[PDB]
Amino acid sequence: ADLRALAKHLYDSYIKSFPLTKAKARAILSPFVIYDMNSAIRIFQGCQFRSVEAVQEITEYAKSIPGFVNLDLNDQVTLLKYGVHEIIYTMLASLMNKDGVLISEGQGFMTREFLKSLRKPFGDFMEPKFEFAVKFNALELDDSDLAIFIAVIILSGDRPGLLNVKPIEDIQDNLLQALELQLKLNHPESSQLFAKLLQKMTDLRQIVTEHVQLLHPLLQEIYKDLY
Amino acid sequence: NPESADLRALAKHLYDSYIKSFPLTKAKARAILTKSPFVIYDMNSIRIFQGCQFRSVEAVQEITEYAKSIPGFVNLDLNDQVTLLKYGVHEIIYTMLASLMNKDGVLISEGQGFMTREFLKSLRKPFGDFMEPKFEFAVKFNALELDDSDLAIFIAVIILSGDRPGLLNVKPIEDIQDNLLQALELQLKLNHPESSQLFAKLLQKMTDLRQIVTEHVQLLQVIKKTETDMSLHPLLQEIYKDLY
Ligand SMILES: O=C(O)[C@H](Cc1ccccc1)Oc1ccc(-c2cccc3ccccc23)cc1
């Protein structure tokens, strides 16, 4: 059918857009372990720099989603604006376990306790994403499921200020069918995977809103607006 | 298929419990909105907020009665019963509230009145924005064209969520929600054969549900201290105490 072609195309584009896949993360999870100060504001700013990296990679991945480049430009702008943060957290889950997260494209690993011990502002920076990551990682998704999931996420017709919702929901419809079939084929004995996955978007958005809540002139200019 | 039959029996039980638990259903509300209400559209007729607290508390009682009928719920560990009710009852209040709203206003007083959206937008201090997020949700949610038989399973699903903060025995809850989600899927396929992937879109609406409740929590924090003379009910106070 159409849905396996769509799923293979999306998987191939995910492999090509994202250097460090979930499979490689699971493989690792040897990295340099950062467990304390001997191994503040530098960690937070580094996370924002990695985030701008990732925004660029995600936008490139979005352009490969069939139909997306054809949409009205304002609607592509606002879909990426509100989608990239939820996708960043979805992809960050791939790099985490209960004890820490892999950083630096897989060569480092920083511990959850070292992150939890930072001074007042930065001590809760990461803790909601660890709490979420444990739940999301319990779904035991792999890369081919995530490739379709994040596309679904990008094609969300509820973002405020959308000009033309109809083609976007049409595409998300195709994607949703493709995802449902992908999860039936890959996870036979995972009874209601589709529904549980869609439920996870509620925690995704709650993370995003809480993180928005918590939040050199040329550098200031590069790393403003898209977080 | 033999399993679809079991899901049908579950759906029928849930629907029957819904009808028994909520005196004013979506069907009656729609019938009244299209036997006719008195309309309130300006002052000529703080008080409204206390009315909303009285109705909220009554809704909490009705939803607790419904919850007791969801198969398995009363057999759960009493602490998880308290946690699920604490985290689910407001999502359910806004869900059922959408049934009573259209673009222009909302039914009040057991259906005998209708208060206009603009009037509710014109209220003083930080009260003008009380109903707006609800009207904005209601317009999108009513667009799904759900009926009582769909809603009855949906709100059960909303109660039995295994990601609620602080649950002890997640396993029985995810088993119940798995069952309820199969039941809802079947019901929506049979009852709305032509609406494509309605199940996915309904499940996606839970996101806006949670955004409504967390924004209402903030607004509540801003409301209670401006007017130290205002009063909050212990039931709602205890539901909001911990939270997020
Ligand atoms: O959240 C809920 O339980 C309901 C939901 C709901 C929405 C619409 C119609 C019916 C019910 O909203 C409420 C919002 C406000 C107050 C309230 C009343 C009196 C004094 C207050 C002082 C500080 C804060 C809140 C106060 C009660 C319920």
Swiss-Prot record, chain A:
Nuclear receptor that binds peroxisome proliferators such as hypolipidemic drugs and fatty acids. Once activated by a ligand, the nuclear receptor binds to DNA specific PPAR response elements (PPRE) and modulates the transcription of its target genes, such as acyl-CoA oxidase. It therefore controls the peroxisomal beta-oxidation pathway of fatty acids. Key regulator of adipocyte differentiation and glucose homeostasis. ARF6 acts as a key regulator of the tissue-specific adipocyte P2 (aP2) enhancer. GO terms for cellular component: chromatin; cytosol; intracellular membrane-bounded organelle; nucleoplasm; nucleus; receptor complex; RNA polymerase II transcription regulator complex. It comes from the Eukaryota. Changing Q48P: In colon cancer; sporadic; somatic mutation; loss of ligand-binding. It comes from Homo sapiens (Human). Rosiglitazone binds at Q48, F49, R50, S51, H85, H211, Y223. Keywords: Activator, Biological rhythms, Cytoplasm, Diabetes mellitus, Disease variant, DNA-binding, Glycoprotein, Isopeptide bond, Metal-binding, Nucleus, Obesity, Phosphoprotein, Receptor, Transcription, Transcription regulation, Ubl conjugation, Zinc, Zinc-finger. There is a cross-link at K16 (Glycyl lysine isopeptide (Lys-Gly) (interchain with G-Cter in ubiquitin)). Highest expression in adipose tissue. Lower in skeletal muscle, spleen, heart and liver. Also detectable in placenta, lung and ovary. Residues 2-225 form the NR LBD domain. Belongs to the nuclear hormone receptor family. NR1 subfamily. One of its GO terms (biological process) is fatty acid metabolic process. Phosphorylated in basal conditions and dephosphorylated when treated with the ligand. May be dephosphorylated by PPP5C. Interacts with FOXO1 (acetylated form). Heterodimer with other nuclear receptors, such as RXRA. The heterodimer with the retinoic acid receptor RXRA is called adipocyte-specific transcription factor ARF6. Interacts with NCOA6 coactivator, leading to a strong increase in transcription of target genes. Interacts with coactivator PPARBP, leading to a mild increase in transcription of target genes. Interacts with NOCA7 in a ligand-inducible manner. Interacts with NCOA1 and NCOA2 LXXLL motifs. Interacts with ASXL1, ASXL2, DNTTIP2, FAM120B, MAP2K1/MEK1, NR0B2, PDPK1, PRDM16, PRMT2 and TGFB1I1. GO terms for molecular function: alpha-actinin binding; arachidonate binding; chromatin binding; DNA binding; DNA binding domain binding; DNA-binding transcription activator activity, RNA polymerase II-specific; DNA-binding transcription factor activity; DNA-binding transcription factor activity, RNA polymerase II-specific. It is found in: Nucleus; Cytoplasm. A motif (9aaTAD) lies at residues 217-225. The 9aaTAD motif is a transactivation domain present in a large number of yeast and animal transcription factors. Induction: (Microbial infection) Expression increases when incubated with M.tuberculosis or its lipoprotein LpqH; induction is TLR2-dependent (at protein level). It is linked to Defects in PPARG can lead to type 2 insulin-resistant diabetes and hyptertension. PPARG mutations may be associated with colon cancer. This is Peroxisome proliferator-activated receptor gamma.
